[PDB]
Nucleic acid binder design. Structure first.
Lengths: 43, 116, 136, 177, 75, 50
RNA sequence: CGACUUACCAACCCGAUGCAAACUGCGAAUACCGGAGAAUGUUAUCACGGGAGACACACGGCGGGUGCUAACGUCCGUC
RNA sequence: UCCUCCUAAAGAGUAACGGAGGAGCACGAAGGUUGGCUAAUCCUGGUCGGACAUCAGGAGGUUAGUGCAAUGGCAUAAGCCAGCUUGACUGCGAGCGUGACGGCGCGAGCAGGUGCGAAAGCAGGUCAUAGUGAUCCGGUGGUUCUGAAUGGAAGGGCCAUC
RNA sequence: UGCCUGGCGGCCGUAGCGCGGUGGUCCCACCUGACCCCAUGCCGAACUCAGAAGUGAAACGCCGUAGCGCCGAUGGUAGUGUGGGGUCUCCCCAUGCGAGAGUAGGGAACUGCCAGGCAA
């Protein structure tokens, strides 16, 4: 894995409106707010 | 294919040594039991071989297929070649990068008398 | 007026007509016209012979042409001295060796087939004979 | 990584029972995922390539590489060796977390959603699809980007045919409408 | 608009199979490598094959592609 | 024949020089190859000149 | 957004038939190069020296280009 | 004038105001070495994207590519990518090819000093074959070689080059 | 000595493709992890290191099958050197050499050195 060439991949906790919370490592930033997820959605 | 890529990689070196007409030290590497062989210029007979597959050399090193194993095999080929009489040889990578176990085997061999 | 399309070269050497024909057997129809003599057939001659048979058979049956010109022939213009390069292409000819099958035909009676081929051979510059499809 | 444990926990057994294979490795398994972005408009403005690469780094966990034209074609005014797109291939562990983000936060956020397609198979077991806009992924704030360009996704597995690939994907609760 | 040609380069085999040659003598002159150098035979920059040792020249076919080789044996 | 001929002068005091060609339109900067000087029998830096 | 037929145009392929100086997945006879051997030939061979002439060729056979598979035509190869 | 194919008759060579095409360069890298890689064309899925951009898989085995026309060659790649570099080096050169000659071409090996590689080794430009002009006269730099009474110098010679 | 396995060759399509079966005691492959050695013009993909859980799925080796590729006669034919002849822009005779394609058929290899396991 090359160094100082990739974006930061820090962990962050995200929760949606329907009460589902999960931890994901991404580049979103500081905080995230969601309304729908895999479940609790009219898919 | 891993084998096809490796053979293609080593073909030029093998041909160069073949036309040069000199005894060559050929090493075969796998996830376990690194091998080594000495081949006559004609390529038809094996002067001497060593490896960690035989109990005579596999009864000391903790695990076969590491840096320590390469040094043992590299050393093992040395005194065998010196005892046989042949001194100068040409190292053959056989398509294996000369970085880790292959380098360790060669380093052990060269410091043990088989200068090349 | 049979003629190739976008041939590789405009002109080619005269060559020679030695040898022996290859397509010596009927392969498509049941009757055919075999070449006895040796020579070359122009595109005009092939067209004239083809028209003669089609009229003779009254557009009944099938007609196969087993020869293609695929060979340009040049001719110097009148009142032109020798030299100054190869002449311009004028017409296309097909080299014919003995035994070559010129035309093949099927779907008509043998009796009507003989006269149709006889009319065509009358408009060709090489001795020809009538042949029938052989069993193997 | 969590679904990788989920895959190793009973999905392999689910694959085992349904296809009653002889061995365990016979079950299909994903090995890598690939992201493509055929921008195409590098000729009009090559400056946008860098930012077009940047967002893919936002969705992905690593730096993309810019692909160059295989050959020059007069119908597109593109010369050989000219960058006209970028791609990303992710495997190992990082693919799993991205697969989570796609299957949990991305698919539901599709504008005018109707259902994930089930006929998008190459005929050997590899799945491909595309997206209209970037805001589906959370890494876009709607104010730092002003482009409508989309991207393509493609997941490749060791399936020998579509039937096991579709069955394997179904085990991952794919919509397949 | 024709009439142009190039001076002939006099290529071809200079020494044929079964005749002794001296070291450094030209065996084959060729544009490409129709014949490949074998034993005691060297290849020049223009693909010329010359003898690197004194002996008898022989031709043979070897390799998976059945490509022709020229060798020299010290006889 | 846009390519024009230049002279490479040894950095040593010896007057030996090499002659070559270069394209000033594309590569206008000087040439600093390291070549062998037989007067001193050493490899030295050669500078471009007229 | 499913999808279907065709009296009608037709790609790529498959089976059969041909053609090519500037096509070859095949391939002679001769010729040419090298080696060994007997007979034969006034050394017929090669190298060096003295003296030349000649450098407008023609027809015939064979293999061709050109021309009209015309020319006691013209241009090459070999006897 | 030079290069490639055919004519040219299976060694070489071989004419015509015979049939086809090209050259009067380019490149400090497109050279050297070390390490690695392997196309064209089709089929299926996929946003713009459409027969033809990019991605994934499959058939294919070089129909690709090789700075420039053609022929021969090229998987050990001579084709594609990257690191380090200047052997595109000096003095020679056994032995051959090719020419009537002037001349042109190939070249192991030796000495000196370099580059790449752990090393065996490779490198005296470029996949090869066109990219070129004798001699005279004169210019520039080096070299007591000479320098017409002597010491210098001028001018010549030799070497590199225009 | 035999069934096997790996490496280095000879030989190069009778040796290569397609279909079916077969192999984990060793060896081989896949495979877990990779902070460190090493690398991605991004990716433990590839290369490299630390391992051996699991497996014979893929690949690889072996066996069977002619469905292809491939090899291939005898005979005849074409061509052809030399010497003659003809209704001589093409052929024939005596003698020497003798294809290509196709046919019957063959055919899904053989072999040397070294190292390791099992049975001997």
């Amino acid at each position: 894995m090359k160094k100082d060439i990739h974006p930061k991949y820090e962990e962050i906790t995200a929760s949606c409106s329907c009460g589902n919370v999960m931890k994901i490592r991404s580049t979103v930033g500081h905080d995230l707010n969601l309304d729908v997820c895999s479940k609790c959605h009219p898919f | 294919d891993k084998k096809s890529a490796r053979i293609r990689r080593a073909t030029r070196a093998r041909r160069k040594l073949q036309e040069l007409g000199a005894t060559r030290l050929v090493v075969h590497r796998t996830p376990r039991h690194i091998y080594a062989q000495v081949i006559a210029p004609n390529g038809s007979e094996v002067l001497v071989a060593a490896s960690t597959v035989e109990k005579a050399i596999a009864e000391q090193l903790k695990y076969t297929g590491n840096k320590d194993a390469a040094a043992a095999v590299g050393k093992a080929v040395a005194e065998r070649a010196l005892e046989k009489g042949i001194k100068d040889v040409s190292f053959d990578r056989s398509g294996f990068q000369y970085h880790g176990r292959v380098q360790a085997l060669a380093d052990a061999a060269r410091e043990a008398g088989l200068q090349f | 007026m049979l003629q190739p399309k976008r041939t590789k070269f405009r002109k080619m050497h005269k060559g020679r007509n030695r040898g022996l024909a290859q397509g010596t057997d009927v392969s498509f129809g049941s009757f055919g016209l075999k070449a006895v003599g040796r020579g070359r057939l122009t595109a005009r001659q092939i067209e004239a012979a083809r028209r003669a048979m089609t009229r003779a058979v009254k557009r009944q049956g099938k007609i196969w042409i087993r020869v293609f010109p695929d060979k340009p022939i040049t001719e110097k213009p009148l009142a032109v001295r020798m030299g100054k390069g190869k002449g311009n292409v004028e017409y296309w000819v097909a080299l014919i060796q003995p035994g070559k099958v010129l035309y093949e035909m099927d779907g008509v009676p043998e009796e009507l087939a003989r006269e149709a081929f006889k009319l065509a051979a009358a408009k060709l510059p090489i001795k020809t004979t009538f042949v029938t499809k052989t069993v193997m | 990584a969590k679904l990788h444990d989920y895959y190793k926990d009973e999905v392999v057994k689910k694959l085992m029972t349904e296809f009653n294979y002889n061995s365990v490795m016979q079950v299909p398994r994903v090995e890598k995922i690939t992201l493509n972005m055929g921008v195409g408009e590098a000729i009009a403005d090559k400056k946008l390539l860098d930012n077009a690469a940047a967002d893919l780094a936002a969705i992905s966990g690593q730096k993309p590489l810019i692909t160059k034209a295989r050959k020059s074609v007069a119908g597109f005014k593109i010369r050989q060796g000219y960058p006209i797109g970028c791609k990303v291939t992710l495997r190992g562990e990082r693919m799993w977390e991205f697969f989570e983000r796609l299957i949990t936060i991305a698919v539901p956020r599709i504008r005018d959603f109707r259902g994930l397609s089930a006929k998008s198979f190459d005929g050997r077991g590899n799945y491909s699809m595309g997206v209209r806009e970037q805001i589906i992924f959370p890494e876009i704030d709607y104010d730092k980007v002003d482009r409508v360009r989309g991207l393509d996704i493609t997941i490749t597995t060791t399936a020998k045919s579509d039937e096991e690939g579709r069955a394997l994907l179904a085990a991952f609760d794919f919509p397949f409408r | 608009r024709n009439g142009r040609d190039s001076e002939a380069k006099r290529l071809g085999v200079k020494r044929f199979g079964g005749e002794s040659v001296l070291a450094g003598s030209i065996i084959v002159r060729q544009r490409g490598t129709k014949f490949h150098a074998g034993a005691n035979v060297g290849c020049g920059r223009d693909h010329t094959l010359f003898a690197k040792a004194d002996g008898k020249v022989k031709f043979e076919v070897k390799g998976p592609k059945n490509r022709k080789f020229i060798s020299i044996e010290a006889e | 024949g846009i390519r024009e001929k230049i002279k490479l002068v040894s950095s040593a005091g010896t007057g030996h020089f090499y002659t070559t060609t270069k394209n000033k339109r594309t590569k206008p900067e000087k040439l600093e190859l390291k070549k062998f000087d037989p007067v001193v029998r050493q490899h030295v830096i050669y500078k471009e000149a007229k």
